[PDB]
């Protein structure tokens, strides 16, 4: 369970000294990679989040107009073009408060939800760098809320279920819930943080969620939730998190027109569930210890022959596969059954299909699994069918 | 027929001063540019390409490497850490060959079809910029096929094949191919150079492709291809293009062992069939003026009630057609039905539901389009079925 380790084993990723903390995803990682993107798509489309695309760099006017210049000037990566100062974004919350800006917000359209699969950077010491953990370059499944106080607790509750749901898909049941205390310097009046504290206490209460406070000073913009995952060694992976900011919609204009047709400044909630989803891919890996589940798997099949027979035989197979939406190869190498099977075996393929002169006769498929298991000559469509479950559930162990 | 007013009107994107040349990609406009996606992907896959995810910055020494530092060090963003200096990367060709150096590499792994969605930033003049037509920061359908100077003809069909293919889906049949003339500095043997005009001549020759020569001083690397399509106004768009490179692979040590078991390093071939895909969104949204075909049309179809009775009718049929993967949205506003069709009709939503007190205890659906014709009462299965074929073919009418 070394994910870097793995991650060479299995063509996932590589880096180099070109550029230190950014990931070159090859292939077989970034099918990975796009089928987290899938999953999580599939968890917006349930609670109606927006997706959208900013831009990569933005004026440091607009960085210095949200305050983050000051705190975290550091860790931005800077860049210029005819004398003028841009940054290369390291936060996709501003970006996301721009397209709220565009066009007139009534209440009507509160809350809304606006997620992105977003590329940010930061200009983290070169030393603390880590594999896949500790990076420059990342990828957040970030989301931002815009509504009223009153919604605070509907939008928290929202978010609690998309954390837990999200982490069990993965096996992920025991999380630890950290709340923030509030600091000396905040931003927003008592009366906001009050009331939002109260949203919190309910919506946690509602969903019977054990939770401590952090040592840490919290932050001044908002309450902060912490949500961390354990996984099958009890180690704690802190990968949630809801924000509430009463400062930066404020900061940058952000505004809609009230019930009482008055202008009110909305609230904004950031919230991410796995986090850096290249640290989560990470974790992943390390979790499975590059078993991956076959809604996961690079390679779920591999349709191998014996001889040269079969191998027209196994091209049909793979093609028929492949239009059922399933990642297949074929592997009709010169090479023994015995080699093949220990190969792709090696290479954690969730399933492997032999084609002998009496599977061709037949019409079936033999069928190996990646632990060794053998589960005999079995239809072709029954194969599909079961797979296609497999993938469609997502489930975590084979058949 | 002006993509950037179109453009405001459906919503799908906007543009501020802070950061010229990025698109603020709206939740709709992304929609478009997440469906041009799973199109090209689909393509991808009947090509076997890989899809990879490179850096989006790479150390200077590398791009000094290549010797693209001289020729665009005036168009790089640069940028900066730790004493290094970096490139926002403008192009993804030294990234894949990167991937490519990973691992060894025999000519049983070529030809190599390396494809990404990669985003690149150019320093163009903020005078130049011009909506999605003129960019600083762009997505190319970008690929590199990594392949012996024996499968340059094989390999030349088949971006010829996809260039016609992929246009054709969007309505483009008149295409214009143009050639290059090799210039008089050029890297690699004139031998090369003659084997590989062959391999293009009789390539073309086979697809029956009547073409022209350019010009233009041609590129120094190699020989190039470029495809331009017409749209319905007749006016000339230069999207596609095919450029062998003799001099890339050898500078970054690219290289693969032969079957005479001799290191010899690989031909490489640039190819991108959209070209920039944010300014072919542009281009779309000119060509169809807003009409988007089914597949693209960010809300593909609204369901409205006539009053409250049917509005929990309406919600029932809105999931229904959510979870046979129609993007739907519902429209129970306090407006009568006279105005919410005419508002939908304006922002081009292909088809929309109409649910009367008949239609809540038919079980069927009144049906209109955003053409203004009526299709009638008509069965909510028959209904889904005949989109679910209108949205996965790609096709360009309606019912
Ligand atoms: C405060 O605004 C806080 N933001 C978040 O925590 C956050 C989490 C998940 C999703 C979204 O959209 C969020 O805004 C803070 O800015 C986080 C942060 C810390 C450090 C740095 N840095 O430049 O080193 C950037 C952001
Ligand atoms: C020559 O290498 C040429 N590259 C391409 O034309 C190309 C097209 C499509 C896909 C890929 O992967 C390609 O490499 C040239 O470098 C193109 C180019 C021109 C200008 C600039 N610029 O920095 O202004 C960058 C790239
Ligand atoms: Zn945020
Ligand atoms: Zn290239």
Same mark, same amino acid.
């Given at each position: 369970?070394?994910?870097?380790?793995?991650?060479?084993?299995?063509?996932?990723?590589?880096?180099?000294?070109?550029?230190?903390?950014?990931?070159?995803?090859?292939?077989?990682?970034?099918?990975?990679?796009?089928?987290?993107?899938?999953?999580?798509?599939?968890?917006?489309?349930?609670?109606?989040?927006?997706?959208?695309?900013?831009?990569?760099?933005?004026?440091?006017?607009?960085?210095?107009?949200?305050?983050?210049?000051?705190?975290?000037?550091?860790?931005?990566?800077?860049?210029?073009?005819?004398?003028?100062?841009?940054?290369?974004?390291?936060?996709?919350?501003?970006?996301?408060?721009?397209?709220?800006?565009?066009?007139?917000?009534?209440?009507?359209?509160?809350?809304?939800?606006?997620?992105?699969?977003?590329?940010?950077?930061?200009?983290?010491?070169?030393?603390?760098?880590?594999?896949?953990?500790?990076?420059?370059?990342?990828?957040?499944?970030?989301?931002?809320?815009?509504?009223?106080?009153?919604?605070?607790?509907?939008?928290?509750?929202?978010?609690?279920?998309?954390?837990?749901?999200?982490?069990?898909?993965?096996?992920?049941?025991?999380?630890?819930?950290?709340?923030?205390?509030?600091?000396?310097?905040?931003?927003?009046?008592?009366?906001?943080?009050?009331?939002?504290?109260?949203?919190?206490?309910?919506?946690?209460?509602?969903?019977?969620?054990?939770?401590?406070?952090?040592?840490?000073?919290?932050?001044?913009?908002?309450?902060?939730?912490?949500?961390?995952?354990?996984?099958?060694?009890?180690?704690?992976?802190?990968? *949630?998190? #809801?924000?509430?900011?009463?400062?930066?919609?404020?900061? !940058?204009?952000?505004?809609? +027109?009230? $019930?009482?047709? &008055?202008?009110?400044?909305?609230?904004?909630?950031?919230?991410?569930?796995?986090?850096?989803?290249?640290?989560?891919?990470?974790?992943?890996?390390?979790?499975?210890?590059?078993?991956?589940?076959?809604?996961?798997?690079?390679?779920?099949?591999?349709?191998?022959?014996?001889?040269?027979?079969?191998?027209?035989?196994?091209?049909?197979?793979?093609?028929?596969?492949?239009?059922?939406?399933?990642?297949?190869?074929?592997?009709?190498?010169?090479?023994?059954?015995?080699?093949?099977?220990?190969?792709?075996?090696?290479?954690?393929?969730?399933?492997?299909?032999?084609?002998?002169?009496?599977?061709?006769?037949? *019409?079936? #498929?033999?069928?190996?699994?990646?632990?060794?298991?053998? !589960?005999?000559?079995?239809? +072709?469509? $029954?194969?599909? &069918?079961?797979?296609?479950?497999?993938?469609?559930?997502?489930?975590?162990?084979?058949?």
């Amino acid at each position: 369970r070394d994910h870097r380790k793995i991650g060479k084993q299995l063509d996932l990723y590589h880096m180099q000294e070109e550029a230190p903390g950014m990931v070159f995803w090859h292939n077989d990682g970034w099918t990975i990679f796009r089928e987290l993107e899938v999953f999580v798509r599939s968890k917006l489309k349930e609670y109606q989040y927006q997706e959208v695309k900013g831009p990569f760099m933005m004026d440091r006017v607009l960085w210095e107009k949200t305050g983050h210049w000051d705190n975290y000037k550091d860790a931005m990566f800077t860049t210029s073009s005819e004398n003028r100062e841009y940054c290369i974004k390291p936060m996709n919350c501003p970006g996301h408060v721009q397209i709220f800006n565009q066009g007139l917000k009534s209440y009507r359209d509160l809350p809304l939800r606006m997620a992105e699969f977003g590329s940010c950077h930061r200009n983290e010491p070169s030393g603390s760098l880590h594999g896949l953990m500790r990076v420059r370059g990342f990828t957040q499944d970030d989301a931002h809320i815009f509504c009223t106080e009153e919604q605070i607790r509907d939008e928290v509750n929202g978010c609690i279920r998309l954390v837990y749901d999200m982490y069990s898909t993965f096996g992920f049941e025991k999380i630890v819930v950290k709340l923030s205390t509030r600091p000396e310097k905040r931003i927003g009046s008592d009366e906001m943080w009050d009331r939002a504290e109260a949203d919190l206490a309910v919506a946690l209460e509602e969903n019977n969620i054990p939770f401590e406070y952090q040592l840490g000073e919290g932050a001044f913009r908002g309450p902060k939730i912490e949500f961390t995952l354990y996984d099958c060694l009890d180690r704690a992976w802190q990968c *949630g998190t #809801v924000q509430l900011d009463f400062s930066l919609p404020s900061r !940058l204009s952000a505004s809609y +027109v009230g $019930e009482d047709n &008055e202008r009110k400044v909305p609230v904004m909630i950031h919230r991410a569930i796995l986090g850096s989803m290249e640290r989560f891919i990470g974790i992943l890996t390390e979790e499975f210890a590059g078993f991956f589940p076959t809604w996961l798997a690079p390679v779920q099949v591999v349709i191998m022959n014996i001889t040269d027979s079969q191998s027209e035989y196994v091209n049909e197979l793979t093609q028929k596969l492949s239009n059922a939406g399933i990642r297949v190869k074929a592997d009709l190498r010169n090479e023994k059954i015995g080699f093949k099977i220990r190969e792709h075996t090696l290479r954690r393929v969730p399933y492997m299909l032999v084609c002998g002169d009496k599977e061709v006769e037949s *019409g079936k #498929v033999a069928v190996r699994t990646r632990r060794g298991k053998d !589960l005999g000559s079995m239809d +072709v469509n $029954e194969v599909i &069918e079961k797979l296609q479950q497999e993938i469609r559930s997502r489930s975590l162990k084979q058949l």
